[PDB]
Design a protein around this nucleic acid. Structure first.
Lengths: 120, 175
RNA sequence: GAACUCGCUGUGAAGAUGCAGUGUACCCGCGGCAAGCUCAUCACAUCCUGGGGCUGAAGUAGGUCCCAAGGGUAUGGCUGUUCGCCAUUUAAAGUGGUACGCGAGUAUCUGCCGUGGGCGCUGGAGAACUGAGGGGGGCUGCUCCUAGUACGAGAGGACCGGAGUGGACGCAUCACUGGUGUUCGGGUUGUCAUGCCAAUGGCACUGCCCGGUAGCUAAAUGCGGAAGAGAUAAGUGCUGAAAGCAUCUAAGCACGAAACUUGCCCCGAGAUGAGUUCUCCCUGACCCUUUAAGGGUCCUGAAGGAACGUUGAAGACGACGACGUUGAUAGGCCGGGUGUGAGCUAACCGGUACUAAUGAACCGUGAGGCUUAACCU
RNA sequence: GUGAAGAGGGAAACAACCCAGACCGCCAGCUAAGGUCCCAAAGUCAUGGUUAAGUGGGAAACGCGGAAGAU
RNA sequence: CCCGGCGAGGGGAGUGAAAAAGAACCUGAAACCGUGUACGUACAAGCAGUGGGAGCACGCUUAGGCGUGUGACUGCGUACC
């Protein structure tokens, strides 16, 4: 405990935290850029990078797993077709995070997460 | 007489020579270069402080670089003191390995423990403090494997050292 | 009512933070422990571990006295019970003070532990240590050549304490025994959803179960209570008068308890008595005054440190360690292994700059004050 | 007699013990009780001894012992 | 006129004797909260004051040792009803 542990706790319900991660990943991939707090931003990057890495291999099983973890027909349809070839040369680090100060409402740090290519 | 400083590679139950799985510690033996030797006149006592490992120059600042240049050896993980046997004196620059340690079978081991956070009173006393991460003085250990080719020192039982933590082994006199 | 709100001893319309004596403590904070059945502390006026005298002490085993608090000094059946009665152990389940000690067991405050900010150690910074001083513990059953041997009339029956073998406890690690390991995999009931089957996902405690990566765990084992040394009380004494003897003492002049210290280790130079070793750096100018460890202005911003960026087997916050484009510090990818069941693989290991770790900025100096002594001038 | 309704000085503080009744001020001296190795001020004074026990510096009655006490 | 948010508020100019009279509007002390001034304090124990007191800045008799502000320290000192 408190030593050699991967993934910040973010005290919440397990199913609730999984659903929030799925929704946040879907929103970010749809919008190509999101504004999220750094503690959640790091978890977002850690949980989203595996999906884009797996998107490189196009197969029925891979598409089924992507839909299972995403539950959005449009997101799966656009995946395996555009992000894959765009970052074919790149191996890892498909996204970047830049800090944007803090939220005035509740002094909450915020950060922009966006694809490294970001366009084209 | 002379001690060594290294790290805990691992701790597993290895088969004995007879063929029985016995707990044994895996301790690497790194060549500890002699950096400075104390004298009873200049400083009041005689003892040798040595260094182990090799750290990049970025971490070491230039005053420490000059100190090591005085020592005549490259900067390493740090400096560890060792009491001299009050007899023969070593030379600055040379390094030593397990070598003669296979002649006592009573060598002592010193080191830290698991990284454990400040625990609650109930779980630690059943009054808030820390357990572990303290120097350990377990003694009366017996050496098992003294293979110097692998630069690994193995002793009977377990070793007081966390994964990747520094530790020392000395030719104890107690039992 | 106001506080610049320490401990012990003595007095006290009687447990004194405010009285007399005595000891300790750099100033200011954060998180806990609640003293004002759990938790303990102290004296011996001693239950044992015991060692020494006497013994109606042949040896074990004992009876009485002298020393010893270093350590321990139970579990059950009756009371609310202290106490007390019965069963089984052990070395014992010891006697007393603390209002049989302990019922604040918005704590404002004092008291104890972990951890920080300011400053001092006299030019600054970096580490490495001597180290006074405080703390952890001196636990224990059995066997073996010694040994049915010396001593002892026979019988009885050693100094031995050298070796191994269990137990209560702390320290240490998950590799063997497994548990946990809702972040890994598989089976599956009801309902909803993907145009529909198959196939997938949410809710029903992770819907309910079968295993389990890394880490943590005791039910697992590794070390252990030294030996030795100094000093010892009682006791035991080699030789020996005053007092033609004796005598532990008057002369010469020793051994000696498990009781004290050291011997092993933790913290520790805030030890203000502020310690020692080494290394790197600062080697400008000008002005004024009440005339000196004086002040002020321009330039300089060195060594070193820290706030940010990646972070950790360090962490409540602080704080410590590593990396920071002169790169494996974190994330991801490949490979290997485990798990699950040809696939997924979180946390296990090697490689990879593919991404994040920048350029920069801030604090920090301009030779270090005075007095005495030895060295070349 | 004290306090009640007298301060002050000595005894470690101590309301009950001892000296001693403050008009005020003054950087003078002399004394009461009590002390003159200091803290804390004064002789480490002088004469002849007891005490060798830290009794002094806490302990009766009883026959030098009695003596064990304030963590 | 300007800052400010096209507000509130404030600052210049002017009126106004006076704006240290501005619509919270005569004069505006204390309790309570700040800044600067001069001094002390980070090895020192208790009704926090009393006499002594070197130093630290200023004006003075232009020193001649005077006071103002303070007290490192010293002996003493156990709130009121």
């Amino acid at each position: 405990m408190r030593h050699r542990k991967s993934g910040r706790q973010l005290n919440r319900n397990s199913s609730h935290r999984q659903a929030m991660f799925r929704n946040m990943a879907g929103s970010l991939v749809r919008h190509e850029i999101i504004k999220t707090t750094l503690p959640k931003a790091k978890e977002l990057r850690r949980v989203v990078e595996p999906l884009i890495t797996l998107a490189k291999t196009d197969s029925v099983a891979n598409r089924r797993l992507a839909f299972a973890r995403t539950r959005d027909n449009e997101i799966v349809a656009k995946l395996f077709n555009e992000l894959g070839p765009r970052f074919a040369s790149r191996a890892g680090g498909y996204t970047r995070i830049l800090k944007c100060g803090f939220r005035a409402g509740d002094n909450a740090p915020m950060a922009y997460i966006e694809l490294v290519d970001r366009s084209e | 007489m002379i001690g060594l400083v290294g790290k805990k590679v691992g701790m597993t139950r290895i088969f004995t020579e007879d063929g029985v799985s016995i707990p044994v510690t895996v301790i690497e033996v790194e060549a500890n270069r002699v950096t400075q030797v104390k004298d009873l006149a200049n400083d009041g006592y005689r003892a040798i402080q040595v260094t182990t490992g090799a750290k990049k120059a970025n971490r070491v600042t230039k005053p420490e670089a000059g100190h090591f240049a005085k020592a005549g050896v490259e900067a390493g993980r740090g400096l560890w003191e060792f009491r001299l046997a009050e007899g023969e004196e070593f030379t600055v620059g040379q390094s030593i390995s397990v070598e003669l340690f296979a002649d006592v079978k009573k060598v002592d081991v010193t080191g830290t423990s698991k990284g454990k956070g400040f625990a609650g009173t109930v779980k630690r006393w059943n009054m808030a403090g820390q357990m572990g991460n303290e120097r350990v003085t377990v003694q009366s250990l017996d050496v098992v494997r003294v293979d110097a080719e692998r630069n690994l020192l193995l002793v009977k039982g377990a070793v007081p050292g966390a994964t990747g933590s520094d530790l020392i082994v000395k030719p104890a006199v107690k039992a």
